């Protein structure tokens, strides 16, 4: 028997004995994580030896404003020794040694279009010491992209891309960027320039691009971003820490992140891909039950396992489509689904023309600003890759399969039924089945062939 | 760290080392079940030696109408060799050896107020062989309390109890009962005369341990022939321990002699103060019991009734559940209106709602949904107050819409540790005795008692 | 038998004979109120002898604009000899003697987030003479914190608190503050710097803090506030009148307000606290039936009687929970209750994050400005009852679903609730304390005799 | 200052010194009641001294079905020694001494159109001992006008009145009645044949001579007369005399003593203004003082009571919290009735009677009457005297005065303001005022001229 995440618990599937298992922490081991007693030495050596920049003790002085940009709770570790906490601690120590007071240093959570961080979210991000040190003084701020009184206009890049920036990060003397270099389904990395281009701008600037936008910010500001990026493994444990100028550091970190993300394990090309998504993963609770977020997750899974899989791919998923449109967090997705169903739109890519219609809605913008919900444009920042490539996608165990059927996904009730239907219709009676347990509870990797 | 059921998965809790763990079967062993090989001999011996009744061959003759009453899907087994399947199979073999026509055998699924069984439910209850052999012939009928053309008003007992019983059972020449002798929170075992008194009666005969026996004996007196019971005692994993068949009235004490040994566990050394468990979404009555506020209160009241003899008077109950507000309105269409009436009336407690029971059992739309949609009868909710007077505080941990748990009188918190700290603050003190019950709603529950 | 306020009338409770009664003023007598024959002398001596400031005759002249800040109807006396009326009368006499004309003097009712005063509210606050003298010329104004063209920006204090101020009180040559020195459940007092901080600001300035904000206003204006505050007793009768600079006079008034507010009477720690809330108390009609205002009142009662009460204290309350949201006065509290019930809100504090969501609502702001309703941020300006008491019983409720949705226990009669509490929490020998008319009087903080 | 009931508490009024105060029991003393010690002797003497039938021993024998008809909770005391409890207890003692089985005794709560009594109501009516002895056996049944399987169509009287009777009372061998003889606004009395005609009849039999004719038709159809045990009550519902026997011949004797109580001679001047207040809970129950139609009923009752003491320029000033609290759980039909009054050609209340048969046949309201313990929909049509006689009716202190204005009643904010307006317009500057400060809390009496 095989155990796949099903909403909150686990669905059991009786797959043929030719099934293979890939858990990206056990099948192929990641590069060794830095031991917890060598983390201080690694951080000190990285901060004291930046790439294409002087040390923090050289760029800091008394009265020089410092803004530290910290990512939100979507990605990265939340443990007692995560990259964010240690990096902030040692950066603060360096700045205090340089002669910068605590009253000046400001912290900004860079969500961009993700919901603004609450008190509990900041507690989980910064820990227990930084939380008590800075939150009550008003020195920890969540980035608001609709606050026209805190957004500055930098003009347009050489390619005509508009650039809007946070005012707080624009008026400081020392801008510090903290990011986690981790893989993305599209092939890019969530390093320094991508983090600055995504988490500091607004929806207009989001609608090679990231490098241009971040370089435009650096030119307008007058001082380049000091980025301290850590290469994370599947358990969000730092492997290497690279600090300094983002442009000359990003390739250095990528040369090692390619070792972790791209796993050469495949010996054959598979026909059936079996997994399941729990209710709460990635963007938060309700992702595994909201149809549009399910489509995005399935598209990411298709992108990640494209090389390992054959032409007529078949994807079997175990998710609880109870129709749970998490509405305190995605207040616009019900209208999005209704517009998709009750219009002339044959496929998801036909929805893009409504993006500016949703990003400018007053009620959803108010909910984004004050209720801690997603920005209405986040649904258009994808879903179409799932529709192509795969012959059929099965959503087994759904509670309201009408929502999974309205997205174009086939619906069944048990893994064996869906597998038998796929064998009868698409993949024949001898399918190469690949089972992915805990594919959404870990940092997913791009599977490739040993060729 | 301890693990508890939470909706579908598992919520983890950090509890002090003094916490004690109880599993119904793993901690204290149930009496040994008969092995799968000896089910043959045990069933044949039980059928060949009925208690207080002649053997079924004597009861059967050519051209005799036989009605076999099979319980619902709530709690009966459903393994490969469950009691229902084996008992039905051997009864059918013996009846065929008695020369009884196959067209005179009729199966009645006795639900009473539980939803009528569909094709999949009937298949799961009866096994694929019996489902293929009998379903398409039309010989498997779910009991319908509101089918007035197929219900017979017997009259009244001596205690003013109206009696209405299925006409199919009334007109048969051999009534056979299939029953599982399993414990109840109140103490009256669920197999025997209770099965006949509850499963083939309408809500008026339920609205009114001696009551069930009186009603069933009145049924036997009116019919002229007693029910032929085939009751099996089950353990936590729904495995047979002993099989008793014959006259229900005289066989019931014999079955109880072993059901008491199974049900009443004697593992205890201290009077515990805090009871910790969790509600899965699907248990007992089906999917949605762990999120429906009324059904959550019912389950909590059952848990209070089971463990009251091991718990103190300032006890605190901490349960993990996902109070989504998911009433499962396709299966309990009356519970949303019931909840609204609870909130929007002069009702301080749940027992104040019983005066509306006759109001709900007579609703035309809910009765239609019960008959044709496979939903619960509207009077099931009124057939739940022990928790709100026995316990000092009841905590619902990890609720997704904590308004429903608060509206029923239960406190709400976010994590097990937070609720335990609050309870230690106010109710049980900083040095409590904790009893943790993982997999309490996944296994057949038992009554806990002091060792002495 | 015992009589407790129940909505509009009274519920009767057969409490055991060991029950104790505390009524403010009646049980322990307050300091003697100034006789009506000495009020003129007291006011004249206070105004002629200010603290840290000179007399109104020494600061006033011909053409110098004067703005008099007067509190709203929530607190203070509405009698024929209340502090507001007499203070305004004698201040006007002094100013007229100095040389200031009536055409210039302006009156501002400082509510802040409380509803703007209507014609009848000004009636009750000011009296016949001042009403007829000043309202019909448009010289009595109710403070509007949402009026962007009548609010000025003073920047941000040294600690990081933004300061918004009323324009009328900013452009005047002589700002005069009238406040009442009365106790608060949290420990602080009303009137003085607190009145100016919470009265003529907006919700952003409200979200030692009051001292910093008020000193920032005084620095920006250049004229310190001339505060004339009277220490009130349980019947809103003046005990002492202190005039002058607020910073150097607040301790002087506090040294005597501590004598009245802090009553050392207890001889034992009580287990059960029994009282009842009428429908109309404090913030107006519907407070005793609105679940959120009920929770606020219960929290205030918990704060006031914390020292007299045991660790396992049980509160029994008699209120008519008819679900009567005074939707013409609290248009937002139904949405607030629905958000509390239908979201991931385990407790009331978890709702604070929605404060900025409500304070910026356009419809509720319009209703606050023009309909005379509460500002939507007043609700977020609660948990103490949940943290402290083992159980809270709301007896006599009409729709107990609302009292249950707040986390409170619901019963039907005092005896049933008392028996339940005895069986569950407080045992069979509880120290019961009964508070008749605890919401119809100026409540006091009960302390221990020793 | 004067005090009046106002919702739940008391509104205070400033009235001139010429105002006269009347309290039914205190101003003029009722005839002396029998003491609590002599209740036993008086009850035994009354039971042993019938007024036209043989004693209860003669009617009783082995195997006799006895049906005892107990009035509703609307009227009559609920003290420790109320008439219902004592009469039932002594009747049961006599029947047991006569050899009547306990299983052949059945109690019927005669409500007729009032809501069916619940468990708590039955407990309060019957006393704890009798409730424990008889309720759980199933021997206490509330009358159900719409229970067609338990209703018998007796036939028709000579006036065309149709007669429908409770089947339980019809088949019994001894029908016994418990009744309280206290006055009505119309001049009748609530005990005697009226109890039979109203309590155990449906709405068709309801839509002084009529009650007697219907009850005597019932007696002639059953073959045996009702055995009545009627008690005269004072303001505090205390017994003055107990009359038992044939109702037709006993009724004048009971009336001879009820006249001395109901009619009070305390008038020396023709009063002009009548001042009182409606409490929230009185007569029919909670919500009578706030429901506009029940407020009109109460005002009409007051007008009928005090019409012989007041002039022809009547002004009625009443304090009530008319907040629109219809108590829809007890009067579910009154909101629709109010809407039909407002939104049709109804100029006055008596114009609505043509819809009475429309409401009494409603299925939803009948279901709520049978199963939810609400009023029968025809109760509201069983109200025009107030608007006919009084020149102006003032509702003082209403919280939603739209309902008081919609029924034709003037609305003001305070007692003094309404009195000033009435003096200005109707009664002049020198009126005669009669103040009733406990009119709705005590059993009302009919005021009359002293001469």
Residue numbers in the entry:
A (entry chain E): 4 to 210, 234 to 407, 411 to 480
B (entry chain A): 4 to 211, 233 to 407, 412 to 480
C (entry chain H): 4 to 210, 234 to 407, 412 to 480
D (entry chain D): 4 to 210, 233 to 407, 412 to 480
Q: Can you quote the paper on this entry?
A:
The organometallic nickel-pincer nucleotide (NPN) cofactor is composed of a nickel ion pincered by two sulfur and one carbon atoms from a pyridinium 3,5-dithiocarboxylate mononucleotide (P2TMN). Notably, although most LarAHs possess two catalytic histidine residues that are essential for the PCHT mechanism, the second histidine residue (His174 in LarALp) in a small fraction of LarAHs is substituted by other amino acids, often an asparagine which cannot function as a general acid/base in catalysis. In this study, we characterized two members of a newly identified LarA subfamily that lacks one of the catalytic histidine residues conserved in other LarAHs. From the structural data, combined with MS and spectroscopic analysis, as well as genomic context analysis, our findings revealed (1) a unique octameric assembly which is unprecedented among other known LarAHs; (2) a distinct set of active site residues, including the asparagine side chain substitution for the missing histidyl group, suggesting recognition and processing of non-canonical LarA substrates; and (3) genomic and structural evidence hypothetically linking these LarAHs to carbohydrate metabolism.
One protein that we characterized from this newly-identified LarA subfamily is a putative enzyme from a commensal human gut bacterium B. wexlerae. However, co-expression with the NPN-synthesizing enzymes in L. lactis produced only colorless protein, indicating that the purified LarABw is in the apo state because otherwise the LarAH would be yellow or brown due to the NPN cofactor. Based on the SEC elution profile and comparison to marker proteins, the purified LarABw was in a large oligomeric state with an apparent molecular weight of ~360 kDa. Like other LarAHs, LarABw is a two-domain protein with the putative active site located between the N- and C-terminal domains. The large RMSD of 4.2 Å for the full-length proteins can also be attributed to the different domain orientations – LarABw adopts a conformation with the active site more open to the solvent than LarALp. The basic structure unit of the octamer is a symmetrical dimer in which the C-terminal domain of each protomer contacts through extensive polar interactions, burying 1076 Å2 surface area. Most of the polar interactions are mediated by the conserved Arg434, which uses its guanidinium side chain to form hydrogen bonds with multiple backbone carbonyl oxygen atoms from the other protomer. In contrast, the interactions between the neighboring dimers are mediated by nonconserved residues with only 300-400 Å2 of surface area buried at the interface, consistent with the notion that the octamer forms through the tetramerization of the dimers. A square-shaped cavity with a side length of ~40 Å is found within the octamer with an entrance size of ~16 Å at the centers of the top and bottom tetramers.
